[PDB]
């Protein structure tokens, strides 16, 4: 068995600009240490099928790109949720087949209302479903 | 199978949860190990390891959902609304040992009135 799984929350509240990687600095779980909390990037060392998910607290317009790739990162999907002024939680999820060295991370856009507070968490999680060979 | 663990439970009651109270999901969809107890509202770990917990809670006023682990608040997600129905969702991966307890709770924002056809669900499963 390969146990690869991470859950990480964001506790810094510096404003995100466009195309910045969204860092989840605080590690709840990081089994096999394939999530990098200094960056916010998961890096695949064991190729196979993975599920990635997040829940982001927000007070305004939030759009985030889910990014994937080895060399140049590419957008898989964009998730958008438009709060007007008020506290909300939004979610996105995806099953990805990953090769070795593929990075997976969330990327900021111009709609950057994402907060990390004790009473309104933002969390990024992922786990291996089935390894390869 | 006794060496696995999976549940999905729902909440069917007109009684709203009290502020700061544990949310009891009183109706089973799947629970073959009995790991969630629908009369106490608590998961209790039988098989140790890494679990994924996730919920989706319907509400028409302000709701914060808290995940607790043996009396310590793990995560909190909040959703504000005044009349319209929305879904509050949250989730977390936790490594658990035998006898550890997991439940969901509300804080001072406690509403769980969905419109008809909008439900509230809590799920968990052992991953490895």
């Amino acid at each position, epitope marked *: 068995t390969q146990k690869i799984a991470f859950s*990480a*929350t964001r*506790t*810094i509240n510096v404003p995100l600009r466009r195309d910045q990687t969204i*860092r*989840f*600095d*605080h*590690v*709840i779980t*990081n089994m096999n*240490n394939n999530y*990098e*909390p*200094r*960056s*916010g990037k998961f890096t695949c060392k064991v190729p196979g099928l993975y599920y990635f998910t997040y829940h982001a607290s927000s007070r305004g317009n939030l759009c985030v790109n889910l990014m994937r790739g080895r060399e140049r990162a590419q957008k898989v999907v964009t998730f958008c949720d438009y709060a007007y002024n008020t506290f909300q939680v939004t979610t996105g999820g995806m099953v990805l087949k990953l090769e070795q060295g593929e990075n997976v991370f969330l990327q900021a856009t111009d709609k950057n209302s994402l907060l990390g507070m*004790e009473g309104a*968490n933002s*969390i990024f999680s992922g786990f291996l479903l089935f390894p390869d060979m | 199978q006794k060496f696995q663990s999976v549940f999905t439970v729902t909440r069917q009651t007109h009684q709203p949860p009290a502020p700061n109270s544990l949310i009891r999901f009183n109706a089973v969809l799947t629970n073959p190990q009995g790991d969630y107890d629908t009369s106490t509202g608590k998961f209790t770990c039988k098989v140790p390891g890494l679990y994924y917990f996730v919920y989706h809670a319907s509400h028409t006023a302000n709701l914060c959902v808290l995940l607790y*682990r043996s009396g*310590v*608040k*793990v*995560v*909190t997600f909040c959703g504000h609304t005044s009349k319209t129905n929305q879904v509050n969702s949250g989730g*977390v991966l936790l*490594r658990l040992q035998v006898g550890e307890e997991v439940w969901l709770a509300v804080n001072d924002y406690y509403d769980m009135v969905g419109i008809q056809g909008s439900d509230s669900v809590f799920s968990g499963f052992l991953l490895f």
Partner: nanobody
Amino acid sequence: QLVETGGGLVQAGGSLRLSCAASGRTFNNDVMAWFRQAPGTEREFVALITAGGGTHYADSVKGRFVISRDNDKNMAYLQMNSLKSEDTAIYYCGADENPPGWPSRWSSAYDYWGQGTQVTVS
């Protein structure tokens, strides 16, 4: 094991850098915290840093202390400025391998400690 170093005698208004060296396992997935104990009162929280570098400070040290860490070298640091006689204490470094989604300021959350280092201010 954690080992605190860097303490000693400082004149008030001065600066001091403490170091906490970790060993046994990698601590890159742990919360690191500094606690302090002056004689006569209890172990008060000073500062903490998450795995990825997120810093959180007590109100008494905000604007004066900087907590940092180096995941490649298994090190955590407390850079202290504008030192006052109230900062005289034994300083303790602690690690939490199993935090909740927000890092704790309670000393009972920190599963390993070191032999503290003594800071004496003027």
